[PDB]
Design an enzyme around this catalytic site. Structure first.
Site, PDB file in Angstrom:
ATOM      1  CB  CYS A  93      58.862   6.624  50.086  1.00 17.95           C
ATOM      2  SG  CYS A  93      60.303   6.140  49.034  1.00 17.95           S
ATOM      3  NE  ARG A 139      57.370   5.247  47.117  1.00 24.70           N
ATOM      4  CZ  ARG A 139      56.516   4.508  47.841  1.00 24.70           C
ATOM      5  NH1 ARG A 139      55.207   4.646  47.649  1.00 24.70           N
ATOM      6  NH2 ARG A 139      56.970   3.605  48.740  1.00 24.70           N
TER       7      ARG A 139
HETATM    8  C1  LIG Z   1      65.923   1.028  46.175  1.00 24.94           C
HETATM    9  N1  LIG Z   1      65.297   0.225  45.067  1.00 24.94           N
HETATM   10  C2  LIG Z   1      66.040   0.567  43.777  1.00 24.94           C
HETATM   11  C3  LIG Z   1      65.421  -1.304  45.402  1.00 24.94           C
HETATM   12  C4  LIG Z   1      63.773   0.640  44.972  1.00 24.94           C
HETATM   13  C5  LIG Z   1      63.681   1.944  44.165  1.00 24.94           C
HETATM   14  C6  LIG Z   1      62.313   2.498  44.247  1.00 24.94           C
HETATM   15  C7  LIG Z   1      61.404   2.806  43.245  1.00 24.94           C
HETATM   16  N2  LIG Z   1      60.207   3.261  43.843  1.00 24.94           N
HETATM   17  C8  LIG Z   1      60.417   3.236  45.227  1.00 24.94           C
HETATM   18  N3  LIG Z   1      61.686   2.755  45.418  1.00 24.94           N
HETATM   19  C9  LIG Z   1      62.921  -0.454  44.171  1.00 24.94           C
HETATM   20  O1  LIG Z   1      63.329  -0.538  42.962  1.00 24.94           O
HETATM   21  O2  LIG Z   1      62.003  -0.984  44.749  1.00 24.94           O
END
Ligand SMILES: C[N+](C)(C)[C@@H](Cc1cnc[nH]1)C(=O)O
Ligand SMILES: [Cl-]
Ligand SMILES: [Cl-]
Ligand SMILES: [Mg+2]
Ligand SMILES: [Mg+2]
Ligand code: NA
Length: 430
Positions: free
Chosen positions: A386, A391
């Site tokens: 993603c 995801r």
């Molecule tokens: C990788 N981080 C933790 C910065 C992402 C985790 C995440 C949640 N849904 C898609 N990605 C974020 O929080 O945007």
């Protein structure tokens, strides 16, 4: 003569004769965990009547109940056959269908012990259901009770969160310790950390390769206006960590189905203790033990050119067509050319197309069937991805549960792909 409260019984022989009928919808009102295969009353064969759909009776208190039913394509002109562990468990659901315009509704009384007990009666189950555990199992584990699908002597219950210890300190499973997702993934790349970092982090959190780790997180209504909406998507985070731990080499990783909501819905006690870690000195296995679970960009590019292989884009539609990036720290908008779209849900912090309203995984046949319509099938090497892999990890985990033999996460995702300006991308409606 329609009767709202007295439901016609359907016999075993009649039900057997209807198993292939396209006009009959067989509906299992037990918990989704039992439907998946968990033997929650001690039955010898777990799972569901072959062809049955999942509609847990707990969902009757959901105001959206009728929309769930319609979205499952269960319609008034179908013949509805309900079963549970007991016919009495079906009574309120049968009445609910009848109150909502379904006039052909029957109750099958003999699923258990008659159907489960005889091996000529077809059943089905989620192949690797024992990785996706119900709350009763976790409660048995922490209580030292005998539980099925467990023969270890060492375990840890781990509450995942992204930079949000309040998600844990506000209420967690007794004895559990918290793991910030930053422990196992890097804020620079948003990819899994190096093997040396993973070794140290796992040891400091008390985890060996032979420890049964039970992961879960807490859903706190992500809002895209907050600086860190991921701090509220705790159970996606839990499954992301499950991915990274299984890649690293923890032999036995479980996920609590539906996360913290499932624990409290079951009525178990919760704790607010800040539980100190019990470190261990040696992880006990080379990291990574399962490198094939993770795909980086050069292999992903090769998969886009191979007939054997595909990348599977688990993003929202406004991301896919380039209206938004999905994330307040990604400026570039667009999509990887040649990936197969498998829409996650409304945005980067919600997985509606892979989950029920109570956050348990969506009925696996529905996921399987939708995926197959796009050529997402188990004979391929698939790399789910993603924006940065959360995801993608949850989609991957759903395919793992189905027993698929070659599934991976392309860790870098759109973040990594778009950070190189030489990489091609598409935008707009296809
Ligand atoms: C990788 N981080 C933790 C910065 C992402 C985790 C995440 C949640 N849904 C898609 N990605 C974020 O929080 O945007
Ligand atoms: Cl979540
Ligand atoms: Cl994409
Ligand atoms: Mg089935
Ligand atoms: Mg990543
Ligand atoms: Na391909």
């Amino acid at each position: 003569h329609k009767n709202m409260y007295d439901h016609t019984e359907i016999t075993t022989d009649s039900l057997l004769a209807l198993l292939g009928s396209e006009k009959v919808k067989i509906i299992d009102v037990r918990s989704a965990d039992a439907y998946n295969g968990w033997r929650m009353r001690g039955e010898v064969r777990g799972g569901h009547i072959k062809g049955a759909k999942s509609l847990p009776a707990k969902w009757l208190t959901d105001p959206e109940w009728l929309n769930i039913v319609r979205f499952k394509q269960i319609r008034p002109e179908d013949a509805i056959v309900l079963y549970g562990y007991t016919p009495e468990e079906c009574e309120q659901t049968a009445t609910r269908f009848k109150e909502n315009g379904y006039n052909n509704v029957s109750v099958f009384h003999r699923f258990h012990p008659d159907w489960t007990g005889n091996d000529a009666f077809p059943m089905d189950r989620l192949e690797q259901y024992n990785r996706l555990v119900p709350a009763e199992w976790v409660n048995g584990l922490i209580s030292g009770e005998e539980i099925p699908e467990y023969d270890n002597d060492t375990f840890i219950v781990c509450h995942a969160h992204y930079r949000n210890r309040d998600a844990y300190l506000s209420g967690h499973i007794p004895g559990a310790t918290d793991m910030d997702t930053l422990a196992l993934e890097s804020p620079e790349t948003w990819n899994r950390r190096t093997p040396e970092e993973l070794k140290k982090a796992l040891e400091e959190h008390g985890i060996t390769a032979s420890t049964t780790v039970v992961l879960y997180g807490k859903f706190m209504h992500p809002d895209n206006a907050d600086e860190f909406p991921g701090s509220a998507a705790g159970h996606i985070g839990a499954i992301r960590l499950a991915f990274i731990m299984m890649y690293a080499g923890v032999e036995d990783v479980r996920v609590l189905n539906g996360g913290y909501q499932s624990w409290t819905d079951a009525g178990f006690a919760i704790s607010k203790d800040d539980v100190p870690k019990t470190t261990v000195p040696e992880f006990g296995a080379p990291i990574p033990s399962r490198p094939e679970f993770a795909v980086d960009i050069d292999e992903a590019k090769e998969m886009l050119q191979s007939e054997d292989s595909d990348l599977v884009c688990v993003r929202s539609y406004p991301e896919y067509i380039g209206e938004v990036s999905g994330y307040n720290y990604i400026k570039k908008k667009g999509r990887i050319p040649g990936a197969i779209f498998a829409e996650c849900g409304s945005d980067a912090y919600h997985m509606e197309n892979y989950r029920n309203h109570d956050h348990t995984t969506r009925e696996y046949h529905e996921i399987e069937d939708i995926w197959a319509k796009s050529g997402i099938i188990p004979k391929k090497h698939l790399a789910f991805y993603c924006g940065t892999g959360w995801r993608g990890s949850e989609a991957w985990f759903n395919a793992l549960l189905m027993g698929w033999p070659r599934v991976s996460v392309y860790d870098g995702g759109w973040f990594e792909w778009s950070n190189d300006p030489e990489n091609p991308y598409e935008t707009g409606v296809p």
